[PDB]
Each structure stands twice: as structure tokens, then as C-alpha cells.
Amino acid sequence: PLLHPERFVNLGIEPPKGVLLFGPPGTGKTLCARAVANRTDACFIRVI
Amino acid sequence: GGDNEVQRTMLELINQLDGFDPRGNIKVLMATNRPDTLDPALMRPGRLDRKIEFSLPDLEGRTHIFKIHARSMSVERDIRFELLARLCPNSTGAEIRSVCTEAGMFAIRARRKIATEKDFLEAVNKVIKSYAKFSATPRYMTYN
Amino acid sequence: NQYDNDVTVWSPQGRIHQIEYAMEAVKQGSATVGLKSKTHAVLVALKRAQSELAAHQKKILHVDNHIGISIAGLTADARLLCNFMRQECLDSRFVFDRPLPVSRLVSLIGSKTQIPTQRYGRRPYGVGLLIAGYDDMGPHIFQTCPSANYFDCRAMSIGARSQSARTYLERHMSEFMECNLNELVKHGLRALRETLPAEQDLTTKNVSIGIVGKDLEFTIYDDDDVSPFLEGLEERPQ
Amino acid sequence: GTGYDLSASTFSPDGRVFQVEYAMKAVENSSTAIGIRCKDGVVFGVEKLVLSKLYEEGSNKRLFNVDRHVGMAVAGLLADARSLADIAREEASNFRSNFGYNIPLKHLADRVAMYVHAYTLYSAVRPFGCSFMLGSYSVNDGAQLYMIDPSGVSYGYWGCAIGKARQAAKTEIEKLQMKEMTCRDIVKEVAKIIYIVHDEVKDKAFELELSWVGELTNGRHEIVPKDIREEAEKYAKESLK
Amino acid sequence: SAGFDRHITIFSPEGRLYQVEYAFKAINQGGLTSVAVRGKDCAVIVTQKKVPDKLLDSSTVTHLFKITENIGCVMTGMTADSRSQVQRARYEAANWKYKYGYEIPVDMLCKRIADISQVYTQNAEMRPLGCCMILIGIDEEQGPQVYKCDPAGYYCGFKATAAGVKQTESTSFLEKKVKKKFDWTFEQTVETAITCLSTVLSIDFKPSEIEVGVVTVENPKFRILTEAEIDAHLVALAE
Amino acid sequence: GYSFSLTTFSPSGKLVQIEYALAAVAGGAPSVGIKAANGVVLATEKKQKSILYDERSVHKVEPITKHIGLVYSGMGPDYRVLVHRARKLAQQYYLVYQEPIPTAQLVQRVASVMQEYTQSGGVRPFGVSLLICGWNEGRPYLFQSDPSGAYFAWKATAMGKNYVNGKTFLEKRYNEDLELEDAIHTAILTLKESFEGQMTEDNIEVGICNEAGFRRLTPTEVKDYLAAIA
Amino acid sequence: SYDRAITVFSPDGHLFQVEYAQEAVKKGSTAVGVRGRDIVVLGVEKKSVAKLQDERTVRKICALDDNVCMAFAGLTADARIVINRARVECQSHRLTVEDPVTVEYITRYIASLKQRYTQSNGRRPFGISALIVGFDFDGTPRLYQTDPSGTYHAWKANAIGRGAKSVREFLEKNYTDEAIETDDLTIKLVIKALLEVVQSGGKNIELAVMRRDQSLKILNPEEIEKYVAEIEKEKEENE
Amino acid sequence: KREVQRTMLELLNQLDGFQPNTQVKVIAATNRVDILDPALLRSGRLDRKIEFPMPNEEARARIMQIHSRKMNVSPDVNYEELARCTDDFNGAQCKAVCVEAGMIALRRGATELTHEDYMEGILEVQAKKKANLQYYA
Amino acid sequence: RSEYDRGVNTFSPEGRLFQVEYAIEAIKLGSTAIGIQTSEGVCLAVEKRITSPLMEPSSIEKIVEIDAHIGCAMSGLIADAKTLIDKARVETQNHWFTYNETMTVESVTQAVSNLALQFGEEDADPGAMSRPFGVALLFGGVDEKGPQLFHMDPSGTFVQCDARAIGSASEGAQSSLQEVYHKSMTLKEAIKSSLIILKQVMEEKLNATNIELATVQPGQNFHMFTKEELEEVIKDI
Numbered sequence A: 001p002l003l004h005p006e007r008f009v010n011l012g013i014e015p016p017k018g019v020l021l022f023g024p025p026g027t028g029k030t031l032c033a034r035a036v037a038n039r040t041d042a043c044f045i046r047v048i
Numbered sequence B: 001g002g003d004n005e006v007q008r009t010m011l012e013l014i015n016q017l018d019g020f021d022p023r024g025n026i027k028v029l030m031a032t033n034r035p036d037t038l039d040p041a042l043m044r045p046g047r048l049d050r051k052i053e054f055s056l057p058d059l060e061g062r063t064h065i066f067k068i069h070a071r072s073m074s075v076e077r078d079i080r081f082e083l084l085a086r087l088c089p090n091s092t093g094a095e096i097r098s099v100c101t102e103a104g105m106f107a108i109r110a111r112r113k114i115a116t117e118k119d120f121l122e123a124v125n126k127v128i129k130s131y132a133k134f135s136a137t138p139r140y141m142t143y144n
Numbered sequence C: 001n002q003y004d005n006d007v008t009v010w011s012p013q014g015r016i017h018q019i020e021y022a023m024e025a026v027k028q029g030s031a032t033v034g035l036k037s038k039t040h041a042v043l044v045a046l047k048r049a050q051s052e053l054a055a056h057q058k059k060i061l062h063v064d065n066h067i068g069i070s071i072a073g074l075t076a077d078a079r080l081l082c083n084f085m086r087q088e089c090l091d092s093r094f095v096f097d098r099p100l101p102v103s104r105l106v107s108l109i110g111s112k113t114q115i116p117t118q119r120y121g122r123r124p125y126g127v128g129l130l131i132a133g134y135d136d137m138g139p140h141i142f143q144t145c146p147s148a149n150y151f152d153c154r155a156m157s158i159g160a161r162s163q164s165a166r167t168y169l170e171r172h173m174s175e176f177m178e179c180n181l182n183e184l185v186k187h188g189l190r191a192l193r194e195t196l197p198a199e200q201d202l203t204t205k206n207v208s209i210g211i212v213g214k215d216l217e218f219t220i221y222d223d224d225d226v227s228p229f230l231e232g233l234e235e236r237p238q
Numbered sequence D: 001g002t003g004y005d006l007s008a009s010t011f012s013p014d015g016r017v018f019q020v021e022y023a024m025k026a027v028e029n030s031s032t033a034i035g036i037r038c039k040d041g042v043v044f045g046v047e048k049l050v051l052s053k054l055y056e057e058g059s060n061k062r063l064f065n066v067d068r069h070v071g072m073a074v075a076g077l078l079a080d081a082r083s084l085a086d087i088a089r090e091e092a093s094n095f096r097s098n099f100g101y102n103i104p105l106k107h108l109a110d111r112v113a114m115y116v117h118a119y120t121l122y123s124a125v126r127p128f129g130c131s132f133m134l135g136s137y138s139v140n141d142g143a144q145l146y147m148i149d150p151s152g153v154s155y156g157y158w159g160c161a162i163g164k165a166r167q168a169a170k171t172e173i174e175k176l177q178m179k180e181m182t183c184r185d186i187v188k189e190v191a192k193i194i195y196i197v198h199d200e201v202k203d204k205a206f207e208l209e210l211s212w213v214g215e216l217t218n219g220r221h222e223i224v225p226k227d228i229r230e231e232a233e234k235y236a237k238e239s240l241k
Numbered sequence E: 001s002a003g004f005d006r007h008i009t010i011f012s013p014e015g016r017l018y019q020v021e022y023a024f025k026a027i028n029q030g031g032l033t034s035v036a037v038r039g040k041d042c043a044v045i046v047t048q049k050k051v052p053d054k055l056l057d058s059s060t061v062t063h064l065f066k067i068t069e070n071i072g073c074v075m076t077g078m079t080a081d082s083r084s085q086v087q088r089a090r091y092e093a094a095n096w097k098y099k100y101g102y103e104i105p106v107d108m109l110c111k112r113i114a115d116i117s118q119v120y121t122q123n124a125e126m127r128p129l130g131c132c133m134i135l136i137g138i139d140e141e142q143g144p145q146v147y148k149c150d151p152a153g154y155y156c157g158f159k160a161t162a163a164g165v166k167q168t169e170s171t172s173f174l175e176k177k178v179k180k181k182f183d184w185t186f187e188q189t190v191e192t193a194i195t196c197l198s199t200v201l202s203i204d205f206k207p208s209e210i211e212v213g214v215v216t217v218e219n220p221k222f223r224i225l226t227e228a229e230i231d232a233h234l235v236a237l238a239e
Numbered sequence F: 001g002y003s004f005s006l007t008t009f010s011p012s013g014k015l016v017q018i019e020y021a022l023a024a025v026a027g028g029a030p031s032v033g034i035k036a037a038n039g040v041v042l043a044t045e046k047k048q049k050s051i052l053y054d055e056r057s058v059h060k061v062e063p064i065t066k067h068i069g070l071v072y073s074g075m076g077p078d079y080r081v082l083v084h085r086a087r088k089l090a091q092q093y094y095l096v097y098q099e100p101i102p103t104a105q106l107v108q109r110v111a112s113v114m115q116e117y118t119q120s121g122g123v124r125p126f127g128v129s130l131l132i133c134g135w136n137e138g139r140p141y142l143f144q145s146d147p148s149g150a151y152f153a154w155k156a157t158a159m160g161k162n163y164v165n166g167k168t169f170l171e172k173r174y175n176e177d178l179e180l181e182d183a184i185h186t187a188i189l190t191l192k193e194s195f196e197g198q199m200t201e202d203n204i205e206v207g208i209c210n211e212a213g214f215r216r217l218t219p220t221e222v223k224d225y226l227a228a229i230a
Numbered sequence G: 001s002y003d004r005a006i007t008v009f010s011p012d013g014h015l016f017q018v019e020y021a022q023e024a025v026k027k028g029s030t031a032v033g034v035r036g037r038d039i040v041v042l043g044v045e046k047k048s049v050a051k052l053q054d055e056r057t058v059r060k061i062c063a064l065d066d067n068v069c070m071a072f073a074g075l076t077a078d079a080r081i082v083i084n085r086a087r088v089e090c091q092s093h094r095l096t097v098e099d100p101v102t103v104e105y106i107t108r109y110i111a112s113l114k115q116r117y118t119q120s121n122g123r124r125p126f127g128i129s130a131l132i133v134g135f136d137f138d139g140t141p142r143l144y145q146t147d148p149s150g151t152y153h154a155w156k157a158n159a160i161g162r163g164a165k166s167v168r169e170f171l172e173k174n175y176t177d178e179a180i181e182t183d184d185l186t187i188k189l190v191i192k193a194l195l196e197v198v199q200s201g202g203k204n205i206e207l208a209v210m211r212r213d214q215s216l217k218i219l220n221p222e223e224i225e226k227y228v229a230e231i232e233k234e235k236e237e238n239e
Numbered sequence H: 001k002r003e004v005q006r007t008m009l010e011l012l013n014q015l016d017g018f019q020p021n022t023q024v025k026v027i028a029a030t031n032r033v034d035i036l037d038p039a040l041l042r043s044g045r046l047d048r049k050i051e052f053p054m055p056n057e058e059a060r061a062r063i064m065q066i067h068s069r070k071m072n073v074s075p076d077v078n079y080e081e082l083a084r085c086t087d088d089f090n091g092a093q094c095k096a097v098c099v100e101a102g103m104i105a106l107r108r109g110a111t112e113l114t115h116e117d118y119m120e121g122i123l124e125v126q127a128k129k130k131a132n133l134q135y136y137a
Numbered sequence I: 001r002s003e004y005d006r007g008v009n010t011f012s013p014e015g016r017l018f019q020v021e022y023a024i025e026a027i028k029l030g031s032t033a034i035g036i037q038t039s040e041g042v043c044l045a046v047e048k049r050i051t052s053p054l055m056e057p058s059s060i061e062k063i064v065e066i067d068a069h070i071g072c073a074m075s076g077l078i079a080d081a082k083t084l085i086d087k088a089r090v091e092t093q094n095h096w097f098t099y100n101e102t103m104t105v106e107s108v109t110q111a112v113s114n115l116a117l118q119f120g121e122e123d124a125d126p127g128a129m130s131r132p133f134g135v136a137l138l139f140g141g142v143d144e145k146g147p148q149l150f151h152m153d154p155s156g157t158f159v160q161c162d163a164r165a166i167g168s169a170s171e172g173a174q175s176s177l178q179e180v181y182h183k184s185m186t187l188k189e190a191i192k193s194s195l196i197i198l199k200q201v202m203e204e205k206l207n208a209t210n211i212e213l214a215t216v217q218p219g220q221n222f223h224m225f226t227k228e229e230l231e232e233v234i235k236d237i
């Protein structure tokens, strides 16, 4: 959605703007988060 | 009301997240182990539109994870990953990493240079069929 | 919610939730369509395949010479009901020596399925049915329901992804009457196709047909027996 | 009030059953059905709703003939109603067999009512979720009309309405002089009453079902013959505009 | 205490069947009231009839039932339960007459109903049938007789009694009257009952608002009173 | 946590529901039973909530047979139930053996039927307790039975409300030997010990069990005894 | 899912109740059995007499029929009931078909009975794991072992009860065609098997030998002492 | 129900027995009203309370139509059926249904939405993950 | 899940009937079995999975003989398998007695299913035990219609399948079969392929005592376990 907003604008569809990742521990949700952070090419902010 | 401070902080957070005029370019991700405890206010879509559930990987996923982890390890090419993936019925990738490490350590203990399928299956027995698996394991003379 | 576990407890809004859950169960099956002219009742079903190798599940069950059945939902309930139906038709023939009118049969089915919604002790029958028959009053296409409610439908479709089928039937509901057998079947399976996703297409393997006419005993067509109907059908629009 | 309404066999501290109360609430949400009693006979009027436009006309009729000389109009869970009908039909049949003449309406309405009440005494079986009326006629006794509710209490009426808009229907019935009008003329009004309370905007299409009993039918219950319903329906629309 | 022993008919600390207790509140739930009195050679029952909607055959609404040619009953509480109990009472009276060959004395019938209620309360899987019953009859060599039951299975004979929402006030007034010395002639008994009901409710009811049923030694038949006669009695009571 | 179902055992002691039924019994009308030298006496308080009630309508001491009385404490309807049952049992025994039921046998049969309701299931146990007279074989008998199904054999006792005071007074007064009349005086005295309000010929019921058959006393006799002091 | 119900599955699929039932068997006194070339033997721990008690009542080895013997491990009362039913079954089978029961048939019957008790709620599964042995017509030695879950098996030699794991390992290590050459050799094998787990009790051993097709005779303690002496003598010799 | 206590007292006295004129009006929204102090509502203080009911089937379909106005929806869609299926939903959930059905359509490359897309969305929001379950033919 | 697992008389908001998915999962903890049907006949292979040398290998009965022409392989709870096998045998004999012929494979599978369907009908045959059965069966036999292979599941459903694999490790076996099978197979080829797949799946090296094999072909009876031929077959491979 951030890379190619043209497609979303074509159909008048908005990005969710927020996603909740959940599942039993050890699934890799944190792993996936860091992975996407690797290729984010933008400011990524963790929390404490 | 001992949590009043954290509660008001969370209320401010949710309000700034959505309501009136948000930025609209703030992609928020959230990782919780037990969302059931989360409040209705945050879980309600609009604030958190997408819900991505990370379930236990299936058989094929487990095979893929095994192959990904073990590739770095020094191991003979003749091992059957699919067999291992089957041997771990419902285990998260963390357990796969654990069994890889355990197999490597078993090999080291034997003063060997390459890991073999036996290393892997006894490691699996250690990391899964040794913590809670011991009930019908010895009396399997119920399933044939 | 503590008003949901049993079927013999009324919700504070005046509802029995187990019935709604049986409704969902019926939604759990695959698609199925039914049409009727003045003369023929034609019911078409789309049958899945558990795996590539296994043979597709049966969706149309032969109940009597003049009564045919399509199912959707639990298989166990379907089989139990089919046995009940068959037995009732046989008893009617034995005692009176005449085909059992469709409406009386549907009424009996409703009266039987109702009881589990009242007396605690067994789940409601979670299967939806399409009953195609021909009696002295011409054809009939009935549609039952786990709630023990049945409807005399001129053209109905039930099962997963059946909304498109119902809309198509309504749009072309006008001319289903005077059409001949071939046209009726073509309309029915065109509706079923409409239910199918964009990629997949009807094939002689995954569609079955059932026909009961004025002079035609109930007949079930599957595999190559269905090729005559399907061939000649207009190409899928894109 | 929670913790006391899980079963019909338990009493609230306030001293009342709750499952019965819930059932009644399940009937109120149903479509209306009114019945008024003229001097020579009785008339029923039901407002059936049409769904999906694919149902054959006359589908799932809400008017039944528990006996040749008796009728019944129902509101609420249809499935339950049909079950009651067969109980009624059996009940009348036994009476004729055991004694040898048509069952008086007052007695039958009692026997069926006892059945409904007995279903609100045990935790194994839920109470019925349909309220229905009964009507008949006979030279020996004259026009009769009764109403029954899930609690199982049967009072005899001059004009009754059960369903969503029972209040609006009753409100309109009061201004009619049922004590002295002929049943033929009653039909025209019943059509008007239903159409007034129909609320076309918030319910969509509907079909008007009408039922007859009286000396006009020699003490027999039969649906009002077509071309009479047509006249009444035409008049009802006219009165509306 | 309450919180666990409040769902099934089982004992509680300081033994207390709470369910049977709630049955009485259910009886009061009806919103009606009734009063019975026993005279020198007569017994009278009075109840208030409330037709709320004109579209209702007033005749069909009634709370006085004829259990047997000589034994009359008045019910209070949930309507359907009262009707069921009435039917049971009729059955028992018929069975007694059939088996033993003479009309059932009122006390024995009341006892039978009480026993049925008791067995219901002891074993689970049947609601206690929260309706209270009053019986009036004439017993040879015993004069008039009034008896009362309750869902709990307790019963007793009375000289004058009340039931329903205003039970306590009516019974207090009746006791005040009874401790006074009166002959209680038929007219006197009916006047006493109607006066008690009116004073408790403070209504000065019209002749269509209440039902009356009297049994007299001269004619043991239990006869339901008619509107004209009740109106005459009411005006006479006004003097 | 337990003490809801009459099936499960406590994690140490005994079933509780039966104890709660006993408690219900305790909070009931006072009753007194004295075994005299040549007879038995039973007495009970019978007070109506008001003057409206009829005191000649329902009784609390009833004859099970020609020579077996019975009084109760606790709930009433259960008393009716098991008095009917006891009458049935006595008649069955008489039919079988053609001889009046000896009291001990009746007591144990009644105890068996009473404990029958304490078995598993939703059937709550009796909330009443019974005292039985009897003069078979030439010596008076006085038995007590309770929901537990156990049956004792008293020389003189008092149960119901304020039974402790009655027991104290009894062991103070009754020694071993009295006739029926002195036993009656002692019994009415015991009732008065805990009885509230002035006693009359209609407040209390009294019955005797002699060598002429058990018999309930009429209001005139009980008035006479109530008079003459005591 | 949970464990408090016999007839409920679990997300994994286990029937936890029966798995728990197996623990009761696991908690009993050890038992062992071996099948010889012409002899079938079984032995039990059967220790700890309580100073002032008799012993003829405490039975752990019982004979189902003149050609079938059995020894169990688990709850005693359940064992008694199962044994009684098995005996009645043997006699009945001989009645319907006039041929003595083969060991396989009786093992199947017992397993079916246990399964039936496992079938539904309202019935607690047997906490017993028996061990049947004997000869059938044509004289073929046979040994069978059953489980509370309702499944049975055939073994050349096996052990159950407490410490059955170690005994089983020892047996599988030692069992060989040589050890079965003669009867005395099998007896000694079983004796040493039990000795490996019964400590040095020696007198805490009871051995039942069904020599070919004569009868189930229980060895006199003196004979067991003799065999123990022989085992110890051989052990000394090889050392 | 101390800084927060002072603040609520401040607001209360500010709105207590004052501002007889109607020139000033305020609206206070509460996610849940059981922790708000009873002094707030009182009688002459905040007596105007507007309950917001759970959107009904007709309301739900209307909401989906409202949010789907911008979207390219094929006329075949039957909002009534979707509302019938969507039980115990709110406006936010309906908006999510619409947007996520649009996302499904985009994922499969469809130019316009379709009833099946809305069904898939409804199944997804609850995370039901519809799949063939065997023993259901 | 979120409740609704405590019985088979309660649906779920999504309509699913738990206590049946769980029973299906139960079979997942049994030894793998494979069945292949070709014009020449039906071949069944199973992994015996022995545990202790002492136990008689024959006692671990994984492939029973329903009738001279019908053989069965099971993988799940043993007791349920035994009950179902007994029912199949009894009903085959009854059909032969009444109609003097040999019952079809489909008829036998359906007769067994009718018993497997009656969880809680409350008026079922003595084989109903409230809970569903926990065994999946494979029936192979040659009847009037040729060779037939039917698969069953605890739900009561049954389906014709030309090639099938069930039990633990069923997924990989199915994936392999899906790409090795072709309609023109020969019984020898089918057996060899079944063994290669099976050994590729099991963790233990294939041995003559590890597996059990059976075959039913038109001319011959079912009663051919290839006993002591397994050595030959494996060593050719």
C-alpha cells in the first residue's frame, strides 16, 4: 500500500492502517516484525 | 483503581491512534501472546483494522523450517527432513531451532564432525517426547 | 454467554441459538439448485472431492420412483433422514398402493425434525434438503431446514455460496415454467456455474443431475451420462 | 434477573418463572394475526410475509383446520405451531371417537391449553414458542373464539390480535360493533385493519390470508373463497387512500 | 446462606426449602385477592374479577370452579397451574365416589391435593405449581366447612380466610371481626365478606367487579351467584 | 464446597445434607415423650398463628394402630406421608402373621423406609423426626427415629425447639418410676418449661399408650389435667 | 477437553480417563510370566505378611480352569470380580460347545468385558491388567496379557506391575531358546527375573508352574529355596 | 468512582447549578457507564442520556451500503443477506467488512466487489478461516 | 474451540461439531497404512511398528480378513477396530445366508458406516457408545464390479478411492501417491511402489518384520499375506 498507492486509489480502497499480530508464543511474530523491518526502507519504531 | 495511571496512558494512546483527524500514514503492528485480555476499545477495528493470527505451522511449513535451519549445520545429505517435521506434531519454529541445536550438541558430544538422522531423532525425542510425552508413550498398546 | 450451550433454553431476546448454529451447519455444505416446469422437476448438485484420487461424494439420493433428494450439511443426518423417507414411502405403497404425495412426506419430515429442537437429548438435524417430486398436482420442489421449517419453492438454491444462484434464479424465474426439459436443465446448471468461483468450471466429474417428470421415473445422471446436458451449454461469460 | 432463568423448573426470588416470560417475547416479534367474532360466525385474518420472492404462493400457511368445524391462526415459531396443530387434530379425533360428536370449542381449547402448560414444568423440555387462536361455530352453541399463549392460559374473546402490533390492532378493533354485524361485512373490515397496521415500509411484501366459519358455511371452516378476498382487499386499499 | 441452595429443592443450613418459599411469592404474583367465610349454616367465597379489556367475554374469565355438585373451589395465583390443580381435584373426587360409593368429604379432598403437592416438592423434576386453593362444602353433622391448601403441601381448616396480595390485612380484619360475637347469618356472612374485601382494597366495587359463591345447608348445591342477586346484596349492605 | 448432593462424601467426615435435615428438625414444635412404669405419654405444642385457624381440623398425634401412637417434630407434610406409610406397614404385617405388629418391628420398618429417601438422586430426605409409643407384650415402649434412619430407644426425652432445656428438666425431675397420671403431669410441666403463652385445652395435644390401646386425650380431659395446678 | 469424563476426546485425541486408569495397574505388585517349550510359569512378588494375619485369603494367582491359569496386578476387588466372571464364562462355554476353552478365547472375553466397562459414563473402568497362561487341546503353550483399555496381546514372556520395566528389560536381554531347553531352566529364569526386583527377599516369591497338562501346582517354599540356592551357587561358580 | 478527583469536582461545580441559559451545550461520551460517578448525571445536571443500541440487521445493511458507496460494488450484492449473517456487529465492524472485502477483490484482481467477497470478509474479520471440513458433503 | 467440546449434542457458532474433529485426530496417532487398487487387484501395505521383541508379531493384527474376498486395514484405537471388524464379518455372513451370494465391497462399507453413525441417537444398535469411534478403515476386495478400494472415517463418511494412505504420516504418503499413481498399474508394480513409499516414510529401516502386506486379486482368495515372500519382494527392491 505504501509502495504503490495508485492501485488502492483506483478502487477507492483504504489501507487498514493498523494490524494486530497474535498467536501462541514462539510462532515468530517478533521474528516476522524484525524481518519486515529489514526491508522497510522507512522509519521503524519499536516500543518498550 | 490502582492501574489508573496505565489506564489513562492507554486511553491517551488509543485516542491519538484513531479519532477526529489521524495522520492516516501510521502503520501500527501489535504482538501479544494473549489478546483475550486486551480491552474492547483497542481490539475494535478502525483502531486495529487487520487481525493476523500466527498459528502453529503445518506439516509443509515444518519441513520448510527444518530445511531452513539445518542448511547451515554440517550434516550428511541423506537425512529425511519430512520425517522429522512429521515427528514434531504441533511445535513452533522455536522448537525446531531447539532440536537443531540439540542435534548439533549430540554430535559434538560424540566427537563427530557430521550429524546423522539418529542425532536428529534422539534430539527430537529429547525436546518433545521427554517433557510431557510419557503417559501412553510406553503403553501405546492402545493405538495400532 | 450461558444461553447457548443447550437447545432447551430460551435466550433473553427470545431465541434458541442452537437452531441458528444448525443453520450455519447447513451453510457448511456445497451448492445445490432446483427448478420445475409444468411437467418436470430438475435438481442439480455440485459435488466436491476430498482428494484428487478419491471419487466425488454423492449429493443426490434416490428416495422413490417419484421422489428425489439433494442434501447439504451433515452426512449422518442426511443418511438418517433418507432412510426415514424411504421407509415411509415403502409403507405407503404397501398399505395404500399409491405414490406418497410429496407434501405429506415433507410434513412428516418437518414433524420428525422438530422434536430435537424441543426435548433435550439429541442435536437438531443439521442438514438442509431439496425434495424434487412429481405427484397428481404436477412437480414440486420443496426445501426443508434444520429448524423444522419447510417451504414450497418454485426455484430454490441452498448451500455454500448459493446467493448468486438465488439471484440468477430470480432474474430468470419468469420463463422456468413453459420451458422444455433441456432448457430447464440448462438454466439449472447455468445457475450452479454462477455459484462456482471464477477459475473453476463445470466438468463432467463434479456435477450431478436428477430428473423426475410426468412420464419419467426419477433418474440420476453422473459422469458421462451428464455429458449430453453439459455439452451445448453456452460458453462461460468473462 | 440471572442465575434463575436457565430452566423453566426454577422460581425467581420475586416468585416467577423466566423461561415462560422469554417465550412470550419470542412470539411478540412475529407477524400479526387478528381475529374478530361476528354474531353469525367468526373470521380470522393473518398477515403472512413473503421472503425472497421465490416461495410458491401459499407457502407455509399460518391458518389450519384442527377440525372441520374449527380453525386456528398462529403466531410465533411456525415449527412449534405445526406441532400443536397435529395435537389438536388428534385431540378432536379422540373426542369424536370416544363420545361421538363434534368437540365443543371451549373444551378443546382447554385440552390443548393444558398440553402447552405442561411443557413449562420440566427442565428437560422448553416451553412452546407460539401463541394461537381458535374459532368455531354451531347452532347449538353459537360463535366462539379463544386465544392461547405459551404460559397456557385460555380466555374467550370478542376480538383478539397476536403479534408485533397487537396493540394497534386491538386499538382499531375496539371501534367496531362486532356484537351485531354480519360476518360477510366483517371480512371487509378485517382487510382494512391489517392493511392499516401492515407498515409496508419496514416489512416489504406480504400476503393476506383470510379464514371463514359460521352459518354462512353451515358450521364448516374454509378459507374465504377467492373473488371475495379480492373484493375486500380492493376495498381495504381504497380506504387507506 | 443463599447463593448455592437456591436452584434445586435441597436443604440449606438452618433447614430452609427456599423453592417452596418462592412458590408463595409466585402465588402473590397474580395480582388478585380472595376471601372466604364460614357462617352458622352457610359458607361464602368472594373474589375480585378484573376484566382489563372490553374485547373479552367476561363470562369466560372466572376464578370460581365447581369441583363437585356440592364442593366448590376458588383458586388464586398462576392461572394455568390453578386450572391444572382444579382438574386434578375433579379427578380425585370422581375416583373417590367411584371406589367407595359416597361423595368425598371436603377435608379428605383437601388432604389429597396437599399430598400431591408434597410429593411434588420432595422429588425434583417438577415445578411446585404455585397456586393456592380454597374449598367450601357442607358436611353432614359437621355443618359448613372451609379448607385451604398451599403449594408446600400444608393444609388446614379455617373459620375465615384470605388469599392473595392483601392476605395479611384481610385476615387481620377478619380476626378483629371474629373475636367479636356475631351470629353470622347468611346475609350477615355475605355482608361481612364483601365489606372486608372492600375495606382492604378501599374500592366500593360495582356489581360486575366481583364474583361470589355460596353453599347453604338448605341447598347443599354449590351455586355461583348472579349479577342481580349480588347487586341486591351490595345495596342492602349499603342499607 | 460439598454439602450439596447426598451422594458424595465429605473429604473427612460424613454427608452434610442429612445433618442439615436434622437441623431443620431441631427448629420445630416442641415435643415430649415419657415412658412411665405402666404406660407411655406423648405431648406436643399445637399453636395456630391466629384465632381463625380451626384447632380440631388437623392433629399432630395420630394412632398408627390400636396400640401404636405417634408424634412428630419438624415439617408436617412429611409427617402425613410417613404416618400413612407406617399404617400400611402395620396392616401388611397383620395380614401376613395375623398378630398385632410389635412396636420394635414397626419402628425399624419405618426407619428403613425413611432412610430409603437418603439414597442417591434428587430425592431430598425427610425433614421430620418421630416418637413412637407402644404397649405390646406387657411392657411400654418409646422409640425415636430420625431422617438418618437410626432408631434409638428412650426412657424419657424431648425434641424440637429448646430441647436442651426440656432434657435438663427431664433428667432433673423424672427418676425412673411413675404412673400414667404422674407421667402426664411431668410431661405437661416439661412443655410449660419451654411453652410460650398461657396453655389452654386447645394449645397442646396429649396422648397416652396404656394396656387398653393408644388413645388421644379429648379437650375435656386435657383441660382437667391442665387444671389442678401443674 | 479435560479428564473428568470417560466418553470425551481431547484435541490431541487421547481418552485421558483410561490412561489414568492404567496407573492403578502400574501401582501394583510385580508379576512375571514365561512360556516354555513344555511348561508355562508365572511368579508374583506377594510379600509383606502383616504379622497377625492369615495368608490363604490373599490370592494373587488363581486358576480360571483346569487348563488355564491367571495372575493379575491392580485393585484387588476388581481382580476378584473379573476372575469370577471369567470362571463362569469358561464353564458356560464348555456347556454350549463341549470343548475346553482355549486361552485366546478367555483372554478375548476378559478384554471385551473391560472394554464394555470402558464404553460409557456411569461405569468406572477396571484398574486391572491381568496375565493369562496355559495350554489348550493339542497341547500348545500360550501366554496372553491384557490391559484395562480393553486390548490384549500374546507374548513369549512379559511382566507387569511395579518395576515391570526393569524386569521386562532383563527378560528381553536373557530370554533365549537355550533358557527354555528344560523345565528347571525356565523356573530358574523366572526366579532370577523376580529376584532382580524383589530385592534379596527370597522368601517373598510365589511361583505357579503349569507343567504341560496336569494341573496348576503352587511350588512349596522349600522348593523355591532350593532353586534360589542353585541360582546363587551358579552365580558363585561363574565368579 | 487526587488530581483526577479535583478535576472531576471542578467540572461538576462548573456545571452544577449554573448556566441557566441555553447558549452553552456539551456532549460527553462514555464507552461504558458504570464507573462514572452518579453525581455526574444527577437530575438537573446531565439528565439527557442517549443510549446507543447495537446496530440491527436493517441498520447493518444500511451501514454497509453507506461505507460501500465509494466502492465499485456490482448491483447483484444483497446487503440484506450480509446483514442477516452478520450478527452482533457494530458500525466499525461493518466498515471493516467493506474495506476488507475491497482488499480481497484487489488481491484476486477483481475490478468490482461481489457478494462472495463480503462473505469472505465477514468470515475473515472474526478470523474463522473457512475451509472444507470433511464429513459435511 | 472456546467451549462446545464437552459433547456431541452441541453445535458451534460456525456450525462445526467438535468431538468429531478430535476423533478424526485420534487416528493420526496410529501406524501408517497404504492401499492401492489396480485392474489386477487390490494391494494393502502397513507398517507393523513393533515395540518389544518378546511380543508375538502376529498378535499385532493390522490387516484382518473380513471375508474370502474382502480384506481390511485399520489405524486407530484397537478396541474400536475390533468391534467394527466383528460387525463387518457378522453382516457379511448374514447377507450370504439370506441371499446366497457374496456381498459387494460398497455394501459392506456402508453397513459398517450405519453402525459408525449412531453416536447418540439414543435408540442405536448395541455398537453405539455415545462418543464416536476413533478408527479409520480401508476395505479392499474384488467383487462383481472388479477390484474396489473404499476408505472410511469415524464421522461415518465413506468414499471410493483408487489409491489412499491413512494414519500417522498419511499426508506425505498421499502426496507421493498422487504423483506415482497411474491408471495402468500392474499388481507387482503397485506393490513395489507401495513398499518404496512406505519405507521412505517410516523412520526405521525397512525390514521383513517391520511391515505387513496383503493382496486380493480376482482368481485368488484374499488369503495371501505374502508371508516369507516379503524378504524376496524387499530384496528385489
Ligand SMILES: Nc1ncnc2c1ncn2[C@@H]1O[C@H](COP(=O)(O)OP(=O)(O)OP(=O)(O)O)[C@@H](O)[C@H]1O
Residues within 6 Å of the ligand: A023, A024, A025, A026, A027, A028, A029, A030, A031, A032, B031, B032, B033, B065, B092, B093, B094, B097
Ligand atoms: N520459520 C520460523 N517460523 C517461526 N519462528 C521461527 C522460525 N525459524 C525460527 N523461528 C524462531 O521462532 C521464534 C518465535 O519467537 P517470536 O518471534 O514469536 O517471539 P517470542 O519471544 O516467541 O514472542 P511471542 O511468544 O509473544 O511470540 C523466534 O525466536 C525465531 O527465531
